[PDB]
Every structure is written in structure tokens, then in C-alpha cells.
Amino acid sequence: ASGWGITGNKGRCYDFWMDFSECMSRCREPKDCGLLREDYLECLHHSKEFQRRNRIYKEEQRKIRA
Amino acid sequence: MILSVLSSLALVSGLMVVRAKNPVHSVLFFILVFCDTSGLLLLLGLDFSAMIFLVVYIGAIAVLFLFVVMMFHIQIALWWEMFFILDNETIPLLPTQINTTSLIYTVYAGKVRSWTNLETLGNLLYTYYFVWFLVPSLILLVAMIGAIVLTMH
Amino acid sequence: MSEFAPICIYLVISLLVSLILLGLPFDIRFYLVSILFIIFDPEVTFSFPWAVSLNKIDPFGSWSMMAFLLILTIGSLYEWKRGALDW
Amino acid sequence: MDPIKYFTFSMIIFILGIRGILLNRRNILIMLMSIELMLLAVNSNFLVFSVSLDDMMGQSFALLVLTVAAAESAIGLAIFVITFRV
Amino acid sequence: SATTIGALLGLGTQMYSNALRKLPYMRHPWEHVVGMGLGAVFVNQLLKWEAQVEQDLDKMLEKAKAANERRY
Amino acid sequence: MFNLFLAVYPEIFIINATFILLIHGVVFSTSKKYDYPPLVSNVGWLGLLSVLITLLLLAAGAPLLTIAHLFRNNLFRRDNFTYFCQILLLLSTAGTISMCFDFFEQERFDAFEFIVLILLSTCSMLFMISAYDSIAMYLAIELQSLCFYVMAASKRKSEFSTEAGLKYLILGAFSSGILLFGCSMIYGSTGATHFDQLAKILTGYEITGARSSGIFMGILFIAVGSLFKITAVPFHMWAPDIYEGSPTPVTAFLSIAPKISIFANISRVSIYGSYGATLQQIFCFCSIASMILGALAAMAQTKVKRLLAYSSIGHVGYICTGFSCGTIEGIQSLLIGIFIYALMTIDAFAIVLALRQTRVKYIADLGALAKTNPILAITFSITMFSYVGIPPLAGFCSKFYLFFAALGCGAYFLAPVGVVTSVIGCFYYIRLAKRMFFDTPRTWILYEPMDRDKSLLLAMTSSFITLFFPYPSPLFSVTHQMALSLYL
Amino acid sequence: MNTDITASTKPEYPVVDRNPPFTKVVGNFSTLDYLRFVTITGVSVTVGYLSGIKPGIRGPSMVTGGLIGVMGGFMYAYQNSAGRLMGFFPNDDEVARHN
């Protein structure tokens, strides 16, 4: 993502991309900070977040059968 | 709700576009597809592109198609994939979205002003990315001189 | 938003009143004009965002837009001398 | 769930357009309208993506591809109207 | 000797272009000198440019040595 | 002008020349003072002059043509690769215009717009080579493809013109639609569309993740799309048909110019935004399919144009086989093959264009060209044997270095199919050539013969083909420079 | 606004001036530059003349060839002089002056 948020501000998921980029291009050591790719793509899709909330509700529901 | 209405209308109207005969019927259903797609975009929260879909997609292209199919009127010579993408457990279960509905954190600081999408789009498109805007001039010029050299005797 | 809701309610009410009023008594010229319109209509489409934001863009914006206009104007000149808009 | 619904609508419209351009082979009008539908679906999912992940270039791309679609439609209909003079 | 190869090449190509269309070999005997000149200058410049691009490629390879030196 | 636009001087000049030629042509084509001159020839010669000037500017200015590093990096980046590719493109366009001058007057069709598009699509392709963003790539491709759409359906009173043009339009628009959906999916799943960002986001760490299933669909669709524009032998529908229908200058330009451009673009993307086996596998299949199809179709044809179409498909196939792996030697041989193919095809089209009118559509009209025009027959045999394979020529040397690189790169499978399609092609062609002194049914002594410029261009390229092996050092060197500076 | 002049390649020669204004460059021309400009204009005018003798517009084709010639020649001369002002080309007399 570039910077231009849909309403004239630093986009919701920029800072993460900026850190990802400065680390991937500054210290070119091999994928030592591919750790930030998960973070940036999470910001883009919230995948881990939705998964966690879904599982919380799953267990909440499972304890209802009791 | 209304989102589903527009989606269903667009779907069935595209079906009629491809299948229904009397090509003028097809062009009518095509106009209808574009109208409901514009309403959909309006629902999405992008107003400028909705009015543009109205102006250039419907009011400009579809009128050309209607003109041409008029002058030649006598020229009459998934549920599996939907389930596979809805059983992923990476989409929030609507029960979750209920309580979290009262959890969003307004900022009150990025909305002291507010760029409507028209204004920000103008900013971006003309200051930066301008060659991306010069090229479409060339493709429009190609369109018009092509129409001329092709049909104009 | 929340204004297109009054808009659409207006739409349906106008439909109702129109139906009420209805029920009470109970070639190349055209084609090339349409093409020229399809070409000059995105011109207005592109002039709309350029119109609102001529204060956060310096003469760079004015000049880029004038270059676009010049390309399409040479298009219009080629159209004219060919006489396609003669009628 | 809404990004899923938007994207699945765009995908099904794209599929419908390609099925139209493949099955129907002779009617040039249906062919060109199906190409228009394909470009419309591309435009719509461009916009949905531009708004889902907060980023702008989606909309610039949308506007430019609108220009491209208008050009293709005009020139292709010219091709047709000269084909049907004989 | 480069210029001689270039001149013979130009003369041959001109005789060729005069032989494709069935008119005789030396139709315009004042073109052949232009052909020899163009062939000579072409071959000379081609040798010069090959030397230059070999130099640049060797510099690029020397710089690529450093890109892998830090790799080790 | 402003010292930044020093990075786009060739494009600025070629666009201004296109505009001035358009205006000149239209006014003095509709001015009643003179008779009613159709300015095809004059506009064409001015266009050739403008193209040579563009060549001069670009070539002599490259080291300052790289002057606007970042401000231009917003859209395109120019390196040695783009330098040499653009030079070859301008050379090819000058060549095809010069070759097609005599066709305009002979076939007698009057539209100077034909030579204001050749330049415009040329600028489009110059943008396409130096293109460093998915959407800039797509826009350049669309501008070029629209120019070609206009160019196809030229003569209306004819028959094959309109149908061939319509086929080409539908095919190209479908291809571009697929490519658009591909870029759309990549954008949606990735969140960027500038090749640096794509590289930095999906290099090395292609490991499968939660929403990693999206990127793959995008790159697959991009592969299909860009394939359709390399004639994509599983997707080669109507390609020989459009080659036969569209006029000869148009089909020549369509064969030579867009293919090199789209190959450079494919290389620029496949270095950056690929997967471990996705793109290489989606090409490894099309390569063998292409070689096999070229063989088993060109073996049996009865129209001298469709034979050219299927031989072009075959050579595009050989090039794609060269594409298989991703080592420096491999891409070096790849580019060498591209160049040799460009030369051989402008040569073959020069011939088939100098044999045009009296042979509207025939292959049996090799009516004793060994007897009525021996030098031309020898030249045709040379060009074809180069196109297929024989002791030292250009095409044979290119294929040999291709297979050398393939073997030395770790693929023991492309060679057998490559060599066997080569040998069946060689048997067929060397049977055809030795069929030129058996007997002669038909005879078409020709008013055609090669005014001056087709003859010069032919002579030049034909002298190049045979005489390539006595000194092929500089080509190897410049190709090494190019491929090495493509990414490293 | 990215209005900076840095190049991917480097000015292998001296760097007498980084971003020279327009008038400076166009007044910095050398005899070779004017020769290049004149040669381009001349060849353009002549080819225009002949390609005009073909359809009978020897005049107007000459004018159009002249326009393209002046455009190309001035662009080529400005490019050469700009290069010699930055370092991407041999600088001897420019360094002599700027000394």
C-alpha cells in the first residue's frame, strides 16, 4: 500500500508497510524480518483477528451445550 | 438487505443480457445491470464513481449501443464454490459482530475536515500519477480517429 | 450519505403519483455524433475533479490539464477537417 | 462478510460475461456487451478493494480502465457497423 | 584491415540489392562507393562498440563480485 | 524543457511528430487547392524520418535518459535492458515502414491515418518496455492494442479484412480482460501494484498462508493473459486466420513489434513477481505444446501466409523453451533468440510482400523462381533454412545456443522435443527447397520486383544471416550486459 | 513534490552544474551543437521536399519537414548541451569556463 488513504490521511495500514520496507531494504539479511510480513498482511486482512474472535465465540457456544 | 436486492437484480439482469433474445431486450437489461451496479457502488460509500457510472457507462456508452442496435433491428440473423468460500472460518461469524458493534473507536481528529472522494481523487490524479492521466488522452484520441478512418467514407 | 434515502423515497413517490395520473382517464451521422459524445464526456468527467482541487495543486495541475485538453483538441481538429461533424 | 459478498458478485458477473463471449459466437452485439460486462466486474472489484484495504490507487485505476472500456466499446462497435454494411 | 572488410561488405550488399531487382549488377556505379563507405564505417564502429561494451560488462562483473563478496 | 523531462525526450518527440503528421495529413488531404492528394507516401516518409530521429535521440542520450530516477520511478524505470530493447523496437519499426511503402501504392488504399498509428503504437510500446507498474503496463498494452485494432480492418470493400479485424479485436480484448482481472486479484490480495513493492512483499516468503490463496490466482490470470498476447499455443485460436486475413504490412508489424515488447515485459515480471514453479510450469507446458503444434501443422499447409503464421508460433515456442529456467546463461540465450527471430521474420515478410499481388493467396506459386528470378529464390531458401535449421546460419546458431543453455541449466527434457520438431521442420523445408527444380506447374512472372527499399532491407538482413557466425562476439557481450543488469 | 534530479547512473565526468536553468543551457551551445541542429533541419527539409514532389505539394511538405526538423534538431542540441552541463558527457570547455 502507498500512503494515500481514502480520506486524505496516512492510510490505515501504512506504518506497518513502512517498517516492513525499511527493514527489508536496509538490513538485507535473508528474511530475518519476514516477521513483519505477517503483520502487514494482517493489517490488510485482519485474518488472525477474525480467526481469534471466531474461536472465542466457538468455545463460548460449545460451553452452552453443558 | 438492500445490498442483496441490488446484487440479485444485477445477477438476473446479466443473465438476461446473455440469454434473452430481441437484442434490444439485451441492451435494456444491460442498462439495468449498470444502473443497479451504480446503486451498489453508492451503497459502498463512493458517491463520485456512482454518478460517473451513471454518466459515462449508462448515459454515454449504452446510448451508443442503443443507437446502433436500433438501426439494425431487423438484423436477427456455483453453490459449491460459495460454500467453499463461506466455510473458511476466516470471515467473522455475525454473532461476533453484534457485541463488537459497540466497540469501534472514532478518532474525532482525522475528521475535523473531510475530503470527499472527488476532492482527494483530483488531488492524487492530477498532481502525481499524471502520465497515468496523459495516456488515456492518447487512447481516447485513438478511439476517435479510429472511428473516423473506419466508418467515415 | 443518508441523503440518497430521501432521494429514493422521492423516486418511489414520484412513481406512485405518475401511475395515478396515468390511470385517471380509464446513419453514420448519428454514429459519429455518439462517438464524439463518448469521447468528450470523459472530458467532463476528468474536468470535474480537476475543477474542485485547483488550490492544492500549483500551476503543475493547470498545465497537465491543459496538455490533456490540447491532445483532445488536436483530436477535435482532425475531426473537423475531416468533416465528420458536417451534417 | 460484506467484502465476500462484493467480491463474489464481481466474480459471478465476470464468469457470466466470459460464458457469454464463449457460448454465443455469432452475435457480435452480445459479444461486445459481454466484454463490457467483464470490464465492469473488474472495475467493481477494483473499487471494493480500494475501499477495503485503505488505499487510493484502486480508484485511479478504476477511472483509467473506464476510459479504456469506453474506447474499446466505441471502436469495436465501429468494426461491427462496417461489417454489417455489405 | 577492418575498413577493408567493411568496404567489401558494402560493395557486396549493394551488388545484391542491384541483383534482386533484375536490373544489372552495376546499375548506378556511383552508389557502390556509398555502399563501400557505409560498410566501412559500420564495421569500424561495430568493433569500437564491441570493445566498449566488453569494458562495461567487465566493470559490471567486477561490481557483481562485491555483491557476492559480502555473501561468502 | 524542464530538466526533468530529459528522461522522456524520445517519447515527447515521437508524440509531437505523430501530432504534426496527423494535422498535416488531414488538412492537405482535404484541401481543394491541390487536386485531392492522398498523402500516404509523404506522411510515411516523414514518419520514417521522425522514427530515425527518435532512434538517434534515445541512443545517443541513454546515460542522461536515466535522469529522473524517483520522480519517474512512480511509473517507469529505465536501465540498460530498456535501452537496448527500445533500440531494437525502433529499428524494427523503421524497417517495417520502409518495407511497406510500396505496398500502399500498389494495393492502392488511401488513408494516411495508417501511418499516424504506426508511430502512435510505437510510442505505446516504448512506454511498455520501460514500464515498472502493473497498471502502467496494462495501459500501454491497451494503447498498443487499440492502435492495432484500428490498423487491422483497413480495406472495407474487401472480404477478409472485416472478419479478420473483428476476430483480432475480440481476441485481444478478451486477453486484456483476463489480464485486468489478474492484476485486480494481485492488488486485492497483496496491497500494492509497483514492481518494487511486489518484489519486496512476495520474494522468498512465498510460503503458503491463510490468505495466500489469492495472490496465486492473480499471477495465474496474469500468466494466461500475457500468454494470449504471445499467441499462447493452447489459446492460439484464429492466429493463422488473422495472419491470413489482415494485410501484409499489418501482419508483419503485428508479428515483429509487439512480441519483443511483451517478451521484455514478461521477463521484467517473471524476474520479480513469480513463484518457485508457477510461471515456469505454466510456460514449460506451452513451450512443448508450441513446438509440437508448429511442427505438426506447418508440415501440411497450402497458403504461404498460414505457413508463416505457424512458423512464427514455432519460433515463439523455441523462445519460450529458452525461458524455462532462470539462470544468466539461459536468459542470455533467450534474448539472443528474440533478436535473431526479429531479423528472420522481417526478412521473410519482405519476401512474401515482394511476392504479393500476382499471388493473392497461393503456395504452389513457386513457379520456377529458381528460373525466373534465381537470386530471389536463393534468398528465400536462405531465409527459410535459417528459420528452421541447417549448418551455420543465424537461426541454427540461435537454437543451438538455446539448447546448450537448456542442457547446462538442469532440464534434460526440452532438448528431445526441441530437436525432433527441428528435424521434422528441416526435413519438410529441405524437401520443399529441393522441390524447386523437379518441375513447375504454374508460372507467375511478376511485375512486383522489389523497387529499392525492400531490396536494400532484404539484402542487408540476408547478408547478416549467413555472415553471423564469423563474428558473434558483440551480440553475446551486449546480451550479457543486458541480462546481467536486468536485476543485479 | 519530487522535483529533484538524481540519476540511476552517475556523472562519470565533472559536475560543473547539477540542474542548469533553461536559458543557461540554450545559451551554452557550442559550434558542434549548431552544426547538429542545422544538419537535422536540412535533411528533414530535403526529404519533405522530395516526398512532396510526389503528390504535388512541394511547398507544404517542405514546411512540415522543416517543423519536424527544427523540433528534432533543437531537442538534440539541448540534450547534448544539458549533458555537457551535468557530467554525463565530456566536459572540457565547460570546465574551462566554470573554473
UniProtKB/TrEMBL annotation, chain A:
Disulphide bonds annotated for this chain are 13-43, 23-33
Q: Where in the cell is it found?
A: Nucleus speckle; Nucleus, Nucleoplasm
What family is this protein classified in? Belongs to the splicing factor SR family. SR subfamily.
Supply the name of the protein.
Answer: Serine/arginine-rich-splicing factor SR34 isoform X2
Provenance organism: Vigna radiata var. radiata (Mung bean)
Q: What is the lineage of its organism?
A: Eukaryota, Viridiplantae, Streptophyta, Embryophyta, Tracheophyta
Report which part of the complete sequence is shown: 2 to 67 of 399
Automatic annotation (TrEMBL), chain E:
Instruction: Please give the name of this protein.
Output: Uncharacterized protein LOC106767534
The source's domain of life comes to Eukaryota
Automatic annotation (TrEMBL), chain G:
Give TM segment ranges.
Answer: 34-52, 59-78
Keywords for the protein's UniProt record, in alphabetical order: Membrane, Transmembrane, Transmembrane helix
Pfam family of the protein (one)? NADH-u_ox-rdase
Q: Which residues form the NADH-ubiquinone oxidoreductase 21kDa subunit N-terminal domain?
A: 11-89
The answer to whether keyword Transmembrane applies is yes
Q: Please identify the protein, giving its name as recorded.
A: Uncharacterized protein LOC106775330
Species this protein is from: Vigna radiata var. radiata (Mung bean)
* Organism placement in taxonomy: Eukaryota, Viridiplantae, Streptophyta, Embryophyta, Tracheophyta
Q: Which gene encodes it?
A: LOC106775330
